[PDB]
Write an enzyme that holds these catalytic residues in place. Sequence first.
Site, mmCIF file in Angstrom:
data_model
loop_
_atom_site.group_PDB
_atom_site.id
_atom_site.type_symbol
_atom_site.label_atom_id
_atom_site.label_comp_id
_atom_site.label_asym_id
_atom_site.label_seq_id
_atom_site.Cartn_x
_atom_site.Cartn_y
_atom_site.Cartn_z
ATOM 1 N N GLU A 11 5.869 93.283 -13.474
ATOM 2 C CA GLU A 11 6.308 93.736 -12.149
ATOM 3 C C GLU A 11 7.677 93.197 -11.735
ATOM 4 O O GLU A 11 8.081 93.119 -10.567
ATOM 5 C CB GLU A 11 5.242 93.383 -11.117
ATOM 6 C CG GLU A 11 3.841 93.916 -11.380
ATOM 7 C CD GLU A 11 3.743 95.388 -11.133
ATOM 8 O OE1 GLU A 11 4.751 96.091 -11.296
ATOM 9 O OE2 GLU A 11 2.643 95.858 -10.768
ATOM 10 N N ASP A 20 12.458 101.585 -2.975
ATOM 11 C CA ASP A 20 12.432 102.282 -4.256
ATOM 12 C C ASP A 20 12.405 103.856 -4.021
ATOM 13 O O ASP A 20 12.738 104.387 -2.947
ATOM 14 C CB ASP A 20 11.183 101.753 -4.963
ATOM 15 C CG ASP A 20 11.096 102.142 -6.408
ATOM 16 O OD1 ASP A 20 10.126 101.734 -7.038
ATOM 17 O OD2 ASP A 20 11.938 102.876 -6.911
#
Length: 157
Positions: A11, A20
């Site tokens: 991650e 994002d």
Amino acid sequence: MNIFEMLRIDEGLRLKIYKDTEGYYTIGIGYTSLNAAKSELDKAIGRNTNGVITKDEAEKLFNQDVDAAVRGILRNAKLKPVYDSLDAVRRAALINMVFQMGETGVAGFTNSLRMLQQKRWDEAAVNLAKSRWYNQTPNRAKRVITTFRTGTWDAYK
């Protein structure tokens, strides 16, 4: 090597917030309106931090989520079974799964699961592999997949 190290290979890590592509804004480790975001970090950690946290707070969070992935496995009737028949290495890749998409989402791969109990490894490595999951994240998709198919962390070293 443990599940934790795994997801941490998986991650990245952010000390500051990140919007994002879908509009998700993530921080620390695998963690999910930019103000609504730094108005939950405020609640998660325990303070005002303007989107930034330390590695501690980042990882305390990690710890939070992970333990959750665990539980969402056992609250489920579809997973606990397949879990119990998996070993450490295979079980964790399942935990890397739920972590990512959550119990319900994984709860969708019935075939792939029935395949993971009979120990049809190969078949479950090719079933999981043909998915909207896989297509979006083939890098980690593939790692956790190799794991499911071999029973070893040779996808992580």
